[PDB]
Amino acid sequence: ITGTSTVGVGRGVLGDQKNINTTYSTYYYLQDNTRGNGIFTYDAKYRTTLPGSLWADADNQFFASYDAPAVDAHYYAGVTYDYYKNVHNRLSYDGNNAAIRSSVHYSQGYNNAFWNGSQMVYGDGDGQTFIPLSGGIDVVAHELTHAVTDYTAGLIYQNESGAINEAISDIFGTLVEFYANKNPDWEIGEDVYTPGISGDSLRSMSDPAKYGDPDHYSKRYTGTQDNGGVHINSGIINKAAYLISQGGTHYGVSVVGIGRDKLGKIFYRALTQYLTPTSNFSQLRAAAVQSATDLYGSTSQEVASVKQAFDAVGVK
Numbered sequence: 150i151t152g153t154s155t156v157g158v159g160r161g162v163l164g165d166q167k168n169i170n171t172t173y174s175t176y177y178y179l180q181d182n183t184r185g186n187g188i189f190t191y192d193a194k195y196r197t198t199l200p201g202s203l204w205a206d207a208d209n210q211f212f213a214s215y216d217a218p219a220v221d222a223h224y225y226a227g228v229t230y231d232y233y234k235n236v237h238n239r240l241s242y243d244g245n246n247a248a249i250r251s252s253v254h255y256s257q258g259y260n261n262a263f264w265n266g267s268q269m270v271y272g273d274g275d276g277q278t279f280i281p282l283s284g285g286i287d288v289v290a291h292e293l294t295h296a297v298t299d300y301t302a303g304l305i306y307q308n309e310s311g312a313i314n315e316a317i318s319d320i321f322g323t324l325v326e327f328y329a330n331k332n333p334d335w336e337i338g339e340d341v342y343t344p345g346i347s348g349d350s351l352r353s354m355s356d357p358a359k360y361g362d363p364d365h366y367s368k369r370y371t372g373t374q375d376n377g378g379v380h381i382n383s384g385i386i387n388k389a390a391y392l393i394s395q396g397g398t399h400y401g402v403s404v405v406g407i408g409r410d411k412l413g414k415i416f417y418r419a420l421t422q423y424l425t426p427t428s429n430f431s432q433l434r435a436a437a438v439q440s441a442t443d444l445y446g447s448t449s450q451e452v453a454s455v456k457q458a459f460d461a462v463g464v465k
């Protein structure tokens with residue numbers, strides 16, 4: 150909408166107060182004009198029609214329980230935009246400052262979030278498996294990263310290419326969580342998953358097997374569930390990325406860690422310069438090796454560590 154840029158205040162899903170960029174024109178709307186061509190947050194009103202209504206508020210204060218998922222979807226989309234711009238010199242998901250749209254209160258008791266080809270969509274959860282999913286910065290960044298992937302490598306959402314697609318979203322979701330630097334970890338979704346159980350998460354990148362996901366190619370899933378295991382076999386790539394950053398010895402193979410920032414540079418370059426819609430795990434290894442070679446040189450430690458990490462997870 151046309152209006153003037155304003156700054157509201159509210160509370161997110163976890164009860165934390167934050168400022169949000171809004172737009173005033175009769176109402177105060179969740180429209181942040183400070184980033185690209187805007188970040189826009191919508192109310193789906195417990196229905197499944199999308200996007201719903203651009204979120205309107207009478208007083209620019211967003212402290213109601215119903216407001217909390219919208220506050221966090223809007224704010225964490227901003228953080229994710231900042232990460233891609235400041236760290237990778239990428240302007241929004243398309244690289245040309247496309248408007249970022251999110252809808253909250255999608256459906257009833259909906260235990261998921263997704264990118265629908267055009268926008269982000271967040272359920273509220275059923276209150277037992279999940280609380281509203283936009284409360285997780287890693288979840289928000291995971292979703293926006295699907296848009297980045299779709300505009301760049303275009304990895305098809307099935308089998309190995311789809312597991313790479315998922316892992317890319319977990320990797321950058323985690324790197325955005327570290328960028329914001331509030332309780333960062335290598336787990337996915339811990340802030341919104343199972344409010345009655347402490348210490349768990351949807352997936353672990355450091356130990357995928359903790360939640361039944363493979364941590365070696367020899368343990369990959371080859372059935373048809375979950376689009377051929379896209380959220381299962383992502384564990385093999387997530388583990389490789391964790392090893393590249395943090396190091397470790399895994400199935401007897403030692404990896405010298407190079408840190409998060411270099412992990413992000415290597416995988417961002419692989420995603421945007423080398424991967425294709427049909428890339429498999431072996432091709433991802435080659436893309437990561439080439440990306441590290443471009444950035445750091447063929448004789449570098451960074452190249453050596455990429456190779457060790459893919460060796461450790463059985464990907465040649």
Ligand SMILES: CC(C)C[C@H](NC(=O)[C@H](CN)NP(=O)(O)CNC(=O)OCc1ccccc1)C(=O)O
Nearest residue numbers: 260261262263264265266288291292295338351380
């Ligand atoms: C229990 C759940 C929460 C685990 C997991 N979901 C996730 O890990 C993440 C949230 N953390 N959501 P996503 O990967 O973006 C789901 N996207 C999707 O299925 O696209 C399918 C799709 C394709 C095209 C258009 C629209 C949708 C699952 O869905 O199995």
Ligand SMILES: [Ca+2]
Nearest residue numbers: 206208210211
């Ligand atoms: Ca209000």
Ligand SMILES: [Ca+2]
Nearest residue numbers: 332333334339
């Ligand atoms: Ca965390």
Ligand SMILES: [Ca+2]
Nearest residue numbers: 287336337338
């Ligand atoms: Ca996390």
Ligand SMILES: [Ca+2]
Nearest residue numbers: 342343344346
């Ligand atoms: Ca929990």
Ligand SMILES: [Zn+2]
Nearest residue numbers: 291295315318
């Ligand atoms: Zn995903």
